[PDB]
Each structure stands twice: as C-alpha cells, then as structure tokens.
Amino acid sequence: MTKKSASSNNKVVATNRKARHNYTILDTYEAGIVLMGTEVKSLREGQASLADAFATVDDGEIWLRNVHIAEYHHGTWTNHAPRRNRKLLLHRKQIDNLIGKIRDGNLTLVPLSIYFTDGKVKVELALARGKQAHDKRQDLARRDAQREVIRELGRRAKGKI
RNA sequence: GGGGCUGAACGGUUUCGACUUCGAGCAUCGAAUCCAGGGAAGCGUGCCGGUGCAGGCAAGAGACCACCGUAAGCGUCGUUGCAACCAAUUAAGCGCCGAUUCCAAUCAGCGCGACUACGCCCUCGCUGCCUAAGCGACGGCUGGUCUGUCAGACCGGGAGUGCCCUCGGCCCGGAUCCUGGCAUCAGCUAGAGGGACCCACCCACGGGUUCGGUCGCGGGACCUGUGGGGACAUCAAACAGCGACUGGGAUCGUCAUCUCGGCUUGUUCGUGUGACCGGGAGAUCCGAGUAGAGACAUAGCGAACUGCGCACGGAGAAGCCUCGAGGACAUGCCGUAGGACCCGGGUUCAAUUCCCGGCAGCUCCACCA
RNA sequence: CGCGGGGUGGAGCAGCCUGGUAGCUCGUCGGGCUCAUAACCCGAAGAUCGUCGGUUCAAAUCCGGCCCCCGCAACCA
C-alpha cells in the first residue's frame, strides 16, 4: 500500500511514534506544511524530531508552532529560524469544521506521518484526545504515569523505530 | 592561499486542495438601497432668519461677531468626553509544607476525693428524705407582729332567682365555715383574682326619604325612647329608596309647543338669509298621556391671494405628487487561477540540474619566498 | 607593521554589499496562580548604534583617523 494501488512513490521518511502513544484513533485529516528549499534536503536522510508540538488557531488559518528541525550535515549552517510560523495549507471546507471542535473539549492537533513525495512533502494531521478524561489530579495520577508509559515504550519497538 | 567531485541532479517533479491578482455574490461595507440644475394652491413666499470648529467626529450655548437694497466661518465662561481600554489558555500537581472545639478539668501517670444556681422564685422554727435539702426553706404537725376568702351597683323586672353586702399596708374584721372530730391554709411577704352589668305597664311622642305621605288600609291602632330616689321622634300590606285607594293639610310637585341658542368649509370675504330654522339628552303658554317606559341634521351661487400696505421673484428646511435603476462608486469574502527548485539571472511551464555564478563547510594543487 | 572580520538595552545574537520610523531570546520592573519560592503567563519601561570628524534633504548604514578585540602573516643566507 504505497499510494492508491500503484500510482506514485511515497514510503520514505518514517512516522513519529509520539502521536500513536499519547493519543487515540478517531479523526484523521491531511494537510501540507509550507516549507522552503533548504528544509527539503534536511528531511531526506531520516532526521526527524520527537519534541512537543501544538497548533494555534488564528482567525481562519492554522499555525502549527513549536517544531524542531535538524538541519545539520558535517559543518555549521546559518539556518533561518527553525521555530518560525509555518502556515499549513488546507481547505476552508475542513478548517471551519475543526475550529469549532478544537475549542470544545480541550483538543489538540498533532501530526501523524510525514509523507515525502517527489521532492514535496505532506503532513498528516489528526484530531484526538489524551488517555485520561480531562484533569482530576487525585483520580488521574496512577494511570497516566504507569499504563501510558508501557504503551509508549512497548509500541515503539514493535514498529521498527 | 586558489580550481571545485557535493548542498532536491534523463526536464514531462500544477499535494483534489492555502494566500494573492481574475470570473461571480454585495450577505457587513461613513445609508429608515439614492435624489433633483422638478411641479401644483386664479404666478410664489415672508412680518424675521443661518453656519461651525482651536481639537480629521459630537453636546450643555451666549440669541459672540457683520451684510453694496441682492444670500458667507466664535472659540465668552463653568462640566467639555472621546486623549477614560485590570487585553485567556492545552493533555506533565501524589515533588516542598499544615493547627481543631460547651457541663468539671487544661503537661502526663498513679494513690485519695470532689464544686456553686437544676428539686430553691420567697425572712425565721420541728420530721421523712430526693445521689446525701450536712436531722431545719416543697409535699405537712405546731409556734407569731405579716389580715388568703361566697365582690360593688346608672336590677328602674313577673317565671326558678333580692345574681351578692369589700378594696392599694385594713376606709373597718374572724364573730355563723379549711386545728382534729368534719368536704379548701407556705399565699413565710409574687398563687396576678375578674371586673361600671343582661330593664314586671304603657307616661307620652312621632306619622317622616318608594308615579310624594299619612288619618279607616294586615297594626287587638302600632313601634320605641322613657317612667317605679327622676324622663321624649315613627311600619315599610309579599317587583325596583323611581311599589298603593274615592276625600281633608304640609313649602304645590313633574312631562312637552314659539322670541333666549349653537354654526358659516384650503387662508381673507363683497352680497344676503336673520334676531330666521333646530319636534337638540334647552326654559316658558295650554292640553294630553299616567308620570321623567322618551328621538331626524342652515346652505348655495363667486370677489381677493401685495398683481389693491412695506419687499423679494429658488428668501433660509409648513406637506404630497412627477423626471431619474446616481455609479455596485464606497469595499474583501467565496468555487480557484497560481506553487519557492540552498538565497540570485536566461528559462520550448517550475531550471545549483542542459547555461551565466555568489557564500559556509569538506576533497584536489606547478616549491624554499 | 600588512590583510580580513567584529563592536547593537544587563549579556549573547538580527539588521551593517540595497543610507526613508533599529527587532528576537534571556534578564529586570509591575500585575496573577501557590501558604510561599521557583517554573508557567502578561503589561510596561530601558540601547540616538565605541568615541571623535566629513559628504547627503536625511548617516547605526557611505568614507577617513584614533583607541580595543579576533583570525591570518610575521618568515630563505
């Protein structure tokens, strides 16, 4: 299963296992991070990151902030603000259906797989929720630090990386 | 220190898909979607009035100030405001630190052992005995200065019944009844009583507010105040406080006809009707009905509109109808056209890749300088 | 002594080949959360560009000199 039976090549660049360990399976959308020509060659060798990330609803557009990019080969590189504002392209037909849901039961927006096509890229968003039900402190302290750690360190070794 | 194997490397590399210029919509967008270089009242109107900005919009306001006879802009004062606005984040809190209470008692343990008003309001003397009134003050024998209790009077009543005869320290008392015989004495100074009363027949008065009223009408004429140690106001005959009889006295009552009265047509009116018409929820002669159970409206014909006084011809916002979709101008959302080929130039779509080449960081060189 | 580069609130970094209103991170001040501190969050203030002189309408920017720092060179008989 590459890209619809046999039509294109899309299998390079692994999937970050952080979203499949602290979240669940419910909603799954597709988007595309607008990047420059420098960030293209910094993700072909499989140099991703496992840092925190959160979206930021602005008017009608989405801005996924807090991201870490390698950009390092042999010597020093001047770079160009790795933690900038990268507008994510989408469809007003989907956006409007996400702002009203992300600002309800305290939901987030974390990426799934990073599909690197012919030079270009394609991020896979998802609308999920944590393993716990809101915050209870006393009633939510023994299941988020014991059972959640097993699902994070157990499912990672099963799917290669 | 200089050239460069490399930084996305047959050119078919518009992610279905974002912005931002275009077709469409105008749903918000300095606006009760617009307005006049337009008209009408015998060619029009008036007897005084307008505008705002020091401070890009708006108020409390003095009627500031002056205009060729023919149209114009202040910042007077006190409050002057918007220049005052405390504008929000994500799923990882058991990691540092916390005292507890009314009857007696207040560091703990042990040996003894319990308090003042609860049953006492309310001086003093004998018992029984409430957890034990330290034989004394309740429930009761008895002993005293302290006076509990069948209580008046505006009953002036036949029928049972004179309903009874003293009061804040008693205005005066325990004599006929609660010492026992023999049916009610701790009120020892606080048992917080229950009271100004409930009218035998007739001395006389009144006849008044229902198509008036009342003397004979249902009332033996009546009701009632009052009188017996001290005196005066009514009845209405079974539909309505707007119900009933032929006749006598009180202040002799009421419904309706014509000369008093109401009007003159979008602003002023000649020229008349006229002191005329109104049987209008207006009086008044006289009659009828049983009453105050009740019912119609004064209009038509044409002289002035500053063109008969002072001025001007859109005088300066008193009202309605006609010419004209006032431009989608004011403005930025929606299906998509377009993608940035390590930042820059040619470029049959994008082009380190097939050409022109600028910087980090790594590989190659013809030297002692 | 030669060449190149560098100086930007308290500090480390933009911007300095194109002279038209100098920004980020951290820290400080003030206002919340907690018993309190730290962490998290926010508002506000703070640098006329090392100094001293020209050109231009306008100089942190172009140019020259002086005072410092850094890299290289400082060396065949």
Numbering used by the authors: 1 to 161
Would you copy out the relevant sentences from the publication that reported this structure?
The 70S-log cryo-EM dataset resulted in one major class of 70S ribosome (with P-tRNA, 99.4% particles) resolved to 3.4 Å (the P/P state) and one minor class of trans-translating 70S ribosome with the presence of a tmRNA-SmpB (0.6% particles) resolved to 12.5 Å. We believe that use of a bigger dataset of about 391,000 particles with a careful 3D classification allowed us to identify this state. Because of the limited number of particles (~1,300), the trans-translating map could only be refined to an average resolution of 12.5 Å. Docking of the known tmRNA bound 70S models of Ec and Tth in our map enabled us to identify that our trans-translation state represents the resumed state with tRNA bound at A-site and tmRNA-SmpB complex at P-site. Ms tmRNA is 369 nt long and shares 50.7% sequence identity with Tth (349 nt) and 51.5% with Ec (363 nt). Secondary structure of Ms tmRNA is presented in the Supplementary Fig. S11. tmRNA is consisted of four pseudoknots (PK 1–4), two helices (H2 and H5), one tRNA like domain (TLD), and one mRNA like domain (MLD). The four pseudoknots of tmRNA form an arc-like structure reaching from the beak of SSU to the mRNA entry channel while the two helices (H2 and H5) help in the accurate positioning of tmRNA on to the ribosome. The TLD is formed by the 5′ and 3′ ends of tmRNA and together with the small protein B (SmpB) mimic the tRNA structure. SmpB is a conserved protein in prokaryotes and an essential component of trans-translation.
Ms ribosome shares the conserved ribosomal architecture with Ec ribosome.
